[PDB]
Amino acid sequence: MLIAIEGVDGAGKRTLVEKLSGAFRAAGRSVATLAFPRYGQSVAADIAAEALHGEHGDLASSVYAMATLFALDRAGAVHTIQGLCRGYDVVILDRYVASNAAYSAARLHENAAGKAAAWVQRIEFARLGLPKPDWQVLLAVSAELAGERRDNYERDAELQQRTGAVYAELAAQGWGGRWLVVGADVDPGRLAATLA
Amino acid sequence: MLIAIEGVDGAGKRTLVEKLSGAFRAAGRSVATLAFPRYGQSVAADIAAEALHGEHGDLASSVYAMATLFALDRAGAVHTIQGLCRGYDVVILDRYVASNAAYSAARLHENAAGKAAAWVQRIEFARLGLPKPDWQVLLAVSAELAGERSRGRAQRARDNYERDAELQQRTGAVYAELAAQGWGGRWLVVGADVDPGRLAATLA
Ligand SMILES: Cc1cn([C@H]2C[C@H](O)[C@@H](COP(=O)(O)O)O2)c(=O)[nH]c1=O
Ligand SMILES: Cc1cn([C@H]2C[C@H](O)[C@@H](COP(=O)(O)O)O2)c(=O)[nH]c1=O
Ligand SMILES: [Mg+2]
């Protein structure tokens, strides 16, 4: 089973990955985790990270350019993902393909049913071969709470809010597959039971 | 012996590659050729090509984004190149790193002294460890004639770089500066009527 944990910056994804992993383990299942972007493991990820901090000229000014970089980072992880899927009962990803759909659409002021979100699906799942997640878990957070709890994306308050809005719609519309929306207080045991 | 052939679109680089290949094989040296972008062998290359034709939204609007894709395409070729440099006396590349420096600078209205060319240097050679070419051969041709070739060899489609006559002229000018200053190593500037056999003896 492949599970992707999604959310805006400051959502608390790392902590949820930890709790959920612990719940599946207590339930008698092996669990492996992987986080994106894979900083320090792929040039694409590192260049994207640098671009978000002002490096590489006009690269970050392009929505599709940035999305392509994150997608190429994931492309180089296909072999790893397939390996984990063959060796573990549950593979939990901290950010996956939906991240690209949400942030790209938000930057273009588009919605979940927009062009960028559709493009992400056509490119990553079909052309790059990224496995579709069985479940995409959105750790939803309001803009106010997020704004409460420094690259180009992090500093852009408007972008974060719009990205949260796109995510909420990607989840409701079942983009890429089935979604579940949870809070940072979700009970690990019940969530794991629901995602079993 | 790593040899890279450079030049604007429609310069006739393919034709020169062949001639140089045969000439080298005559002198008793084995040769392998590889062209960039590696269409069909790299997703980075295929997306770059489609982007040059208007696909993928605003991708092509970013000069550095396009340079990066071509740079990533080559990075995924580092092992294939090293390999060739192992199984053949001479390796001839149709376009290489200098192509990125020339077009990027040209798109930004910069020259060999601009940030873009220096950027391509750091990223491709200093960071991605792409093998420095022994020789970079600039096939200098008439801008009018090169543009006509592209138009003809397609109208019988042209991408965004090919249809930009001013871009092609500037790219030709940047190339001359790169060759003149020995950017990335030693260069050799030749014409369309260059004698194959003589060129080979010169290079090797
Ligand atoms: C993995 C991924 C991240 N991003 C973003 C969201 C973050 O602001 C930034 C780096 O992610 P991070 O904060 O989880 O390390 O890049 C995308 O836009 N698309 C993607 O596919
Ligand atoms: C290989 C390469 C090509 N280009 C260009 C020049 C061409 O107009 C276009 C596609 O190359 P092509 O005419 O050899 O098929 O992309 C770059 O800008 N950087 C590169 O590194
Ligand atoms: Mg061409």
Q: How do A135-139 and B2-6 pair as beta strands? A: unpaired
Which ranges of B42-96 would DSSP assign to H, the alpha helix? Answer: 43-52, 63-75, 78-87
H or E stretch at B9: none
CB contact under 8 A, B65 and A63: no
Q: Exposure string (b/e) for B12-28, b if CB count within 10 Å is 16 or more?
A: ebeebbeebbebbeeee
Contact B93, B133 (CB under 8 A): yes
B57: chain A residues, CB-CB within 8 Å: 63-64, 115-116, 119
Interface of B to A at Cβ within 8 Å reads 43-44, 47, 56-59, 61-65, 68-69, 72, 75, 115-116, 119, 127-128
Q: Which of B43, B56, B63 sits opposite A75 (nearest CB)?
A: B43
CB contact under 8 A, A69 and B68: yes
By most ligand atoms within 8 Å of CB, the mutation choice from A99, A136, A154, A170 for ligand 1 is: A99
Q: Report residue B6: phi and psi, to 5°.
A: -120, 165
A72: chain B residues, CB-CB within 8 Å: 43-44, 72
Q: Which of A56, A72, A128 sits opposite B64 (nearest CB)?
A: A56
Q: Exposure string (b/e) for A117-144, b if CB count within 10 Å is 16 or more?
A: bebbbebbbeebebeebebbbbbbbebe
H or E stretch at B94: strand B90-94
Contact B133, B188 (CB under 8 A): no
CATH number belonging to the domain at A1-196, selected among 3.60.70.12, 3.40.50.150, 3.40.50.880, 3.40.50.300: 3.40.50.300
Structural tokens at position B89: 């006396």
Task: Tell me how far apart the alpha carbons of residues A7 and A183 are, in angstroms, rounded to a whole number.
Answer: 11
Angle of the B63-75 helix axis to the A63-75 helix axis, nearest 10: 20
Q: Which of A47, A59, A128 sits opposite B62 (nearest CB)?
A: A59
Sheet holding A178-182, edge to edge: A31-35, A90-94, A2-6, A135-139, A178-182
Show the ligand 1 pocket: residues with CB < 6 angstroms.
A 9, 36-37, 70, 95, 99-100, 103, 153
Task: Tell me how far apart the alpha carbons of residues A131 and A129 are, in angstroms, rounded to a whole number.
Answer: 6
- CA neighbours within 13 Å on the CB side: how many for B50? 13
Domain locations in chain A as residue ranges: 1-196
Task: Tell me how far apart the alpha carbons of residues B114 and B105 are, in angstroms, rounded to a whole number.
Answer: 7
Structural tokens at position A72: 């190429």
Q: Three-state SS for A93?
A: strand
This entry's atomic model was obtained through X-ray
CATH number belonging to the domain at B1-204, selected among 3.40.190.10, 3.30.460.80, 1.10.260.40, 3.40.50.300: 3.40.50.300
Contact B139, B192 (CB under 8 A): yes
Residue type, B66: M
| Bridge partners for A178 per DSSP | A135
State the resolution, in angstroms.
2.1
